[PDB]
Design a protein around this ligand. Sequence first.
Ligand SMILES: NC(=O)c1ccc[n+]([C@@H]2O[C@H](COP(=O)([O-])OP(=O)(O)OC[C@H]3O[C@@H](n4cnc5c(N)ncnc54)[C@H](O)[C@@H]3O)[C@@H](O)[C@H]2O)c1
Ligand SMILES: NC(=O)c1ccc[n+]([C@@H]2O[C@H](COP(=O)([O-])OP(=O)(O)OC[C@H]3O[C@@H](n4cnc5c(N)ncnc54)[C@H](O)[C@@H]3O)[C@@H](O)[C@H]2O)c1
Ligand code: NA
Ligand code: NA
Ligand code: NA
Ligand code: NA
Lengths: 484, 482, 483, 483
Amino acid sequence: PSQLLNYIDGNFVTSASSFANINPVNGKLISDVFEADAKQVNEAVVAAQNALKGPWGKLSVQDRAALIHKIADGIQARFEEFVAAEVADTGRPVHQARTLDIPRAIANFRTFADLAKTSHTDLFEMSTSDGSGALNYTVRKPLGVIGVISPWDLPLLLFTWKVAPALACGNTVVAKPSEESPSSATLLAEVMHDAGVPPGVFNLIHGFGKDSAGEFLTQHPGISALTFTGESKTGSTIMKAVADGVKEVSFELGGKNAAVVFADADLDAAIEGVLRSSFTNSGQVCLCSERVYVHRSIFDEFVSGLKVEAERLVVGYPDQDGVNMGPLISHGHRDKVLSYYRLAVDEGATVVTGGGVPKFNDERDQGAYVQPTIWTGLSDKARCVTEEIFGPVCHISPFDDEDEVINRVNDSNYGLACAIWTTNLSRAHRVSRQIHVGLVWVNTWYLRDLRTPFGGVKLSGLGREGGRFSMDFYSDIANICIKI
Amino acid sequence: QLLNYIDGNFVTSASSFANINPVNGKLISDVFEADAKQVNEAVVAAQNALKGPWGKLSVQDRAALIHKIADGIQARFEEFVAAEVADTGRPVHQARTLDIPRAIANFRTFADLAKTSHTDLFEMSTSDGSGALNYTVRKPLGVIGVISPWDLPLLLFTWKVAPALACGNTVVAKPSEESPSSATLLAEVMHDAGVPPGVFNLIHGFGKDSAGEFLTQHPGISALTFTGESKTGSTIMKAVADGVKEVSFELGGKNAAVVFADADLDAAIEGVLRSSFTNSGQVCLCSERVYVHRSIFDEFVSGLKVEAERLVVGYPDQDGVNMGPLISHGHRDKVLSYYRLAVDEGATVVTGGGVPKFNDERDQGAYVQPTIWTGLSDKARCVTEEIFGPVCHISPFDDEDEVINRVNDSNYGLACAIWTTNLSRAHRVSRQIHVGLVWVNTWYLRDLRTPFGGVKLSGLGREGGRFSMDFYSDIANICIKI
Amino acid sequence: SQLLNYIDGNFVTSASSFANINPVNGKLISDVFEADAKQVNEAVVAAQNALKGPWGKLSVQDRAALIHKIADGIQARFEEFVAAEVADTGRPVHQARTLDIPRAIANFRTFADLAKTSHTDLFEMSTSDGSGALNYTVRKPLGVIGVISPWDLPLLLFTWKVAPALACGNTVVAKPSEESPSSATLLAEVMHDAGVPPGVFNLIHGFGKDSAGEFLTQHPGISALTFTGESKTGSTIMKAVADGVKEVSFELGGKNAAVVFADADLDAAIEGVLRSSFTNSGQVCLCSERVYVHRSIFDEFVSGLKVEAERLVVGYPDQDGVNMGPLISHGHRDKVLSYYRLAVDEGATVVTGGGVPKFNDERDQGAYVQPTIWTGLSDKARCVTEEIFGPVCHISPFDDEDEVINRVNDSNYGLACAIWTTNLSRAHRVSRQIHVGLVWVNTWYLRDLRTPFGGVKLSGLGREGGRFSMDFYSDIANICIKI
Amino acid sequence: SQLLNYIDGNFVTSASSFANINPVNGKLISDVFEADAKQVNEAVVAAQNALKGPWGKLSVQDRAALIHKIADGIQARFEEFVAAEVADTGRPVHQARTLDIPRAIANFRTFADLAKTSHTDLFEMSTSDGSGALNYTVRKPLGVIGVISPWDLPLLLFTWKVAPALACGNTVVAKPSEESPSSATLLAEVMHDAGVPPGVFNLIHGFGKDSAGEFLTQHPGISALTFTGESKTGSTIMKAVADGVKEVSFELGGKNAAVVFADADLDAAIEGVLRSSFTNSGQVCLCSERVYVHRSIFDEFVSGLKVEAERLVVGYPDQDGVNMGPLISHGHRDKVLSYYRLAVDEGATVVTGGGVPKFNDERDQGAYVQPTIWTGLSDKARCVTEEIFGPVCHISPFDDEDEVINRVNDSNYGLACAIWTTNLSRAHRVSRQIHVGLVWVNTWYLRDLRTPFGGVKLSGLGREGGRFSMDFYSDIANICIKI
Ligand SMILES: NC(=O)c1ccc[n+]([C@@H]2O[C@H](COP(=O)([O-])OP(=O)(O)OC[C@H]3O[C@@H](n4cnc5c(N)ncnc54)[C@H](O)[C@@H]3O)[C@@H](O)[C@H]2O)c1
Ligand SMILES: NC(=O)c1ccc[n+]([C@@H]2O[C@H](COP(=O)([O-])OP(=O)(O)OC[C@H]3O[C@@H](n4cnc5c(N)ncnc54)[C@H](O)[C@@H]3O)[C@@H](O)[C@H]2O)c1
Ligand code: NA
Ligand code: NA
Ligand code: NA
Ligand code: NA
């Protein structure tokens, strides 16, 4: 049907082999995607290094920012095409693509263009023995060639989350989107081309990880940095792969995030919030809550309430009326999720709702759907309470005491996000600062200010991105000291 | 004898190893090597200390306690001088003016930064019209693993330790096997200042199959900050990858100095002498490559030769001394093998090129002579590989763009010194040098607030000023929906 | 027994003297030499000259080191400063030991630290010729700072201005309140003993109009006038420096509210408002003289506050369990009593106090009044709108959140506000809507010295504290290099 | 042609009208309605009210998008705006196309972007009970900003104040110079067409004393007065707002120096000084009217400048290769020629110019003068010390670096300075010692809108640009939460 090409040194190019892009709604072939080989990857990196010496490297910060705004304009002008591309690849509801995914990708470019325009560096004066003094000033320069490897849960959002600041800081890019979701990135390349981004500045390579484009990219000595969002295990692998070149790295990895509902929470608001934090994108967001802790005094009522709301969720077509949830990304991912559904029963869970796959009795039965699922009854040590499942599921457990629940939230090798529900002023601030995660929300979930630092602790990440943190990571910070 | 310091106690080990004075090859002390069991004990005690009295100090009180650590060092100044000198053979004057005062400055400066540092507040609108607040907070990262080298032992040791403690972390610190004494005195100051048990832990030993490796492998740490060789950095980066530990690396360099035709020539010769031979060339920041404009080349080399030959090589306390020995015999071996390699590569030996004769104990030491080469290609191994001795190669250049390209044609990128009196040239050329630090008309001048680090193989991340306050802290974002 | 000026490194007397009077008993405690215009000029000129001297040559590190020595010198004479503050003001010894003196010391240490750690900015830009340019900023001393301070927190407010002034490398001509000259004089001594170069810090005594205060504000030799005191005086001063376009920084009056919502920790709010209304006998610019309490807890709040207010021990600064000393002066008490009288005329119910206590001893010769609580006045009453500056508050009920926000903001002042509530959204939602420089939630007068401090409307001009002081007390210059 | 006030979303006329006069030929350009006190009041009330309308409800993001639309509206009418600026002032068309109009558009865009990216501060602190506290700051609109602007760079300086005011969520009552009312009026059209809510931006026309300008500064309804103009006028406005303790920001006069050191690129310095003395016919606050040149190159410098100055084309704004239009007005020319005579009387050597060109056409009815260069005056001459605001410079030799620094600083003004040297150390060492707000090395009037801008001494009060504007045009509030 469609073909998704690579984009290398200003041209769309095919490849020797291609792989299948499968619509998870109905199991059908969407497109063939040409897999970049090591030769093509090297050509992309070499093109990126050279482009640093071309027109791009000569642009003022203002001209660079203006061009980046043009990239955003071009996405905006093809908004519905990008919507259709994200949807076809992932089965996400159209409304979500229209309200979250595509706007945020546009916003990624604008915000970092803006940050680039307004950012400055530092001036330090000092005295010296000869009483004449000295000046130290800092400058931001492009780091060089940035390798980008991105996942399939929020394909264009996370892809642009990395590409936007990379370009805003004057770097050049070689980027490999998830093999599960390569469409919107390919459209982005067309927008880059049409906007007049110079050849070699942005390069798109398609492929898998190991023994494919992903691995070839991480191993190339020509990149200056590798920014990556994905599985924790994959982060470790990549970190080993770039260690010999001491490449700069930035990792946003797994999580087993908790939501906590205190007895003084607005209960209806918390039920709705947790529904959202557990089942958005069918539980396929790094930020989703797979552990929920609810005060003993409201536990039964919270659980009954969430069950009803979960069962009201419409699981169906992306453009179906009132749809809330699409399928999982792939049959392969469904197999992982269902084996955890199985594991939970074996570990002693009560299945409050879901626990299987919906039966549609139409073509969607050939897709990769599962049911939104709630468990109770597992110990804090259960595998299903400790390992990231990355599906539409949450286990819910009671607690009695604030310090107790804080300790249970923190008792994890992960540390990405946490959502806390309480109407109490002191409790909100006191509790939040004690959660060992990069991001806490109070009385909401996944509310984003793009200027904030974003990242995780422990196995969930290395480094911070967002705002000035991206401006620092994607730049060479250099100190120049002048003796006066 | 030098003991480990673990959970408030000085403890011995099943193995000890020799601390050899490099001036005369004499034994200074036996050093107990921490085994894996003891490294685990240091790490567990570090973790627990976070939950004790240390973790409950206000920022102001923490900073006060840190200023007390600095006072402790100052009150035992000469004792610290003596330890640094003994281990390494550095000139007494260098220790008194550079090494020890900087260590004190390290603690004081980061104490001050901690007291005055703040974070950010972001306001935003939301659909419902009520809005939201996002604010950031800096928390202790947790347990910081510190592994440090021998060139500037106390300075570099405390360059990591001070911000780590100022940010409320606890520390397991492993100083170089070549220079364990001043770090052991520090553990004494820490103890006498009433730093809670477990907050600062000193473990002695080597790298592979030793305390260093054991530290980097321990899942209980939250970060590893390292200063040493590039290949060691790569190794440690691999070691901590499975736990995805935060890392900060300051690694090797092959730094260049550049003398433009319009430089103040006498100041340039003096500056490059300092940048080449300070601490006997054993500083990561030393210039081992020098580029001089063709029109002043011969005059420069002659002038440098003379100055280089007036340098006094001898006892650390021998009045007028300029250079002590290299850190060790093993290290002199490496340096001498490079001395041979330069000749085999076709170098003219303008001066030095071997080892001085003393006819006393110093011949049992590990001395070499300050050495200057000319006549090698940019691709010669002695021009590209870090020697870490008191040596430089000098090469003529003709064009500005030429010398910039030649400076950057390196797998390293730590620092560069440039000499010129021209305003435009100074700033135009500076911004093009692909390194972490550029000095103009000076060398190794340091403001502790500035970002410090290297690019390419010379490092990962930046430390100093807010970059240390950021690295040694968890930055967390809290979002309140209103 | 004699308080001298400190000019160009010398303690000097003056032509005229005035009486420093203990408000506990009305007894003369010292004679204070009033600086005339000639001595004021001499002080400014000496401060100008010191800029060109060793002080101008100090590195920021060295300067900060010396400022810490000043702090050390206050610490070493801690109890004498306490005695000095107490003697002049009648404030409880406990307050002087825990609030007044330690904050003066912290003032010097904090701004020395800020000076040591502050840096400025680098901006890169592109140029037509493609070579680019660099813009960088530096902080330089502004010059000579004229400091004028009030009597409510004498040493705290005096050092609140002098510390950053000196931290930024300025020289200083400072004029403390006629009512409280003692601690400033001891501070001169500490400067002297610390070896602060002559002319760097100059202390002139006197009054305002037609005296040392007036003369300083009109001297063309100063680069800036920072002032804390009455709003009308701020206006006067602003006109006086106009011809010179001097930099100005004003912290002026207020009529601050406290608001207690139905979901507040009622016991904590009662204690809180008690502190906010009667601390330093209600003689702090930040004090709450208007209080709004939700209808559902009004009666219970007023009853609880009455009991606590009546438990307050009014007496000698070193009297065991003392909570309140006297007002600053007999003249100040006469104003406060004229307001007590006015409240009654305006129809107030006097919940407690409303007059002066009878001690039957020397205190009856001093300047005491009772802690006083009113109810029953409308928002337009003069006792509800004009700053009294005594140990008093009016309490009014309210019903709605938007209502009480409007009544708080319906004022020509806008210094500070305290809000009591346990609700998270309300705390943040209400706080941001109060038109003042400083809001506290579930506390009062908690100070982080890094934060901007100041008022809006008639309560001020500019901000001080942290980065704001480093900016105000500095010349910020941009240097632009074409490459 | 006719220029109306813009109030509460409506263009309105007035009882009084005055003439807009083309300085090129003395012809009438338009009539301008002078707003009276009633209308100024109407503007301020409208502005106050608009704070409570739709404007006050916009998110920072949406407010910023609107401001970008304002900039779009000026871009869409670019040439009309060029025509207006040129007509009012006689400035070269080229300068209006490359400096004046583009900077106005950039002003709005830059502050819109600053608003979008700016954040405030979070301070944590410990407390006695061990639970801690949070201090956070927020930026809120200050309120109604009164803006009063001069005629040297009409739209640039007008929008330099209007853009940050609107970006910080304030509402505006703005009074452009009587000499240059056109572009501001066209700006009102752009705002209207972009759908800026009524009352958010108000335009009042008139003069100073007994007119719109004075009335604006006296109105108790404004929250701040930002002003650019003569030093004396700044002093007057500062007195006028003092009773309200209104926030103030002043960018005032200057008598700026250029310094040419012996190691300067001589040709570049000659060209640079020519630009800095004669651009906009010397009618820019940033122009150099004093020039110091090292003795060794003095004669060579003066000769070169004389020749370059005599090659300058003085004529029509669109004339081929024109360098200078006329002065703003015959009245201003009268003042300038008065200074031309005075210099002769003070004993100056007129190196070039010193009179008015003879055109033999309609330009003879205009307000032209010749670019003029003087030598031989002492540092104390009136012509070397008072701001002339015409196309003129005096040149004097110096021998020593410390000497010339002292001579540059020996002034009651302190706006800007341009320095010419090829030496690295000297550029940085000398620049930091010059007591002005802005120094340029090897260039002049190079602007980065993020930098602090302002002057010292009589040249101003406070800073604007970048974070400094974000601070001046906002209420900075501190909110302290006890946890
Ligand atoms: N970039 C900088 O700022 C900086 C500063 C000083 C020194 N250096 C570099 O340090 C080097 C010289 O010092 P060095 O010889 O001690 O370097 P090194 O790598 O051999 O040793 C450094 C430290 O790491 C430890 N170590 C060695 N192997 C280890 C391992 N496998 N696991 C854990 N720890 C291990 C050592 O015991 C020692 O404490 C030079 O390359 C020099 O450039 C760099
Ligand atoms: N906003 C704040 O932070 C703050 C802090 C403390 C006090 N205050 C205010 O201070 C007032 C009480 O103190 P006060 O009675 O001493 O006020 P005041 O303004 O009458 O006197 C203050 C100082 O200014 C001097 N002074 C008086 N007239 C002067 C003049 N014409 N020119 C120059 N100096 C003059 C006085 O001698 C004294 O030193 C209260 O209104 C209180 O709110 C405000
Ligand atoms: Na797919
Ligand atoms: Na040794
Ligand atoms: Na008194
Ligand atoms: Na006109």
